[PDB]
């Protein structure tokens, strides 16, 4: 997962979970990458799938 193209103003809402370094399961890549941007690059990917 590469978030360099973010942020994006909108995301589609399919469910394909990713687990963030904050222990939160992000619903999809777009949601995860937008949160990475919002954290000013502090949030990272833990693993693919649910936390």
């Amino acid at each position: 997962v590469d978030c360099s193209e973010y942020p994006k103003p909108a995301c589609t809402k399919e469910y394909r979970p990713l687990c963030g370094s904050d222990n939160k399961t992000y619903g999809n890549k777009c949601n995860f990458c937008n949160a990475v941007v919002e954290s000013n690059g502090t949030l990272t990917l833990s693993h693919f799938g649910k936390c």
Binding site: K8, P9, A10, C11, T12, K13, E14, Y15, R16
Partner: protein
Amino acid sequence: ISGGDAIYSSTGRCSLGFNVRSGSTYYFLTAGHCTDGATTWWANSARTTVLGTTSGSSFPNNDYGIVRYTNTTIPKDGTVGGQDITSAANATVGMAVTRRGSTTGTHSGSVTALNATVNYGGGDVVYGMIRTNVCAEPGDSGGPLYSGTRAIGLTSGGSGNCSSGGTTFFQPVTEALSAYGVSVY
């Protein structure tokens, strides 16, 4: 199975839009971005109950897809959860609407604009969308947007979440019904 219930592809989970039919052939509508590259659909995460196979998909530009039921025994309710759907209608600014999805359940709000352009990036731009102040979260894609007993649209995407509030864009269902020559029931 009814509008708003979970549907699983090989890639992920979305929500069933509306059950529709043509002659004696039953299908269900969902988001195009969910049907894109999907062949078979199941009713559960275990992939043990087959629903059907993708018959059409339109995304980006539009955001709708249709799946032909192949499961003969499964009930195909013409409802959204328990709510009966009897017709389809065009969205209007200020219209009170309700969305049901497999992750967040049922949430309500209003239509705040029409013919909106949504850029999902990488060339995935969709046009003519209904904008609302209803929230939606991953898994809710394809779920129905309705108003009373009227079918209005299919969940495409947006931003925010249900806790803080958000903005969600929907594909007008009329366009999809017309494209596939099907109707709600």
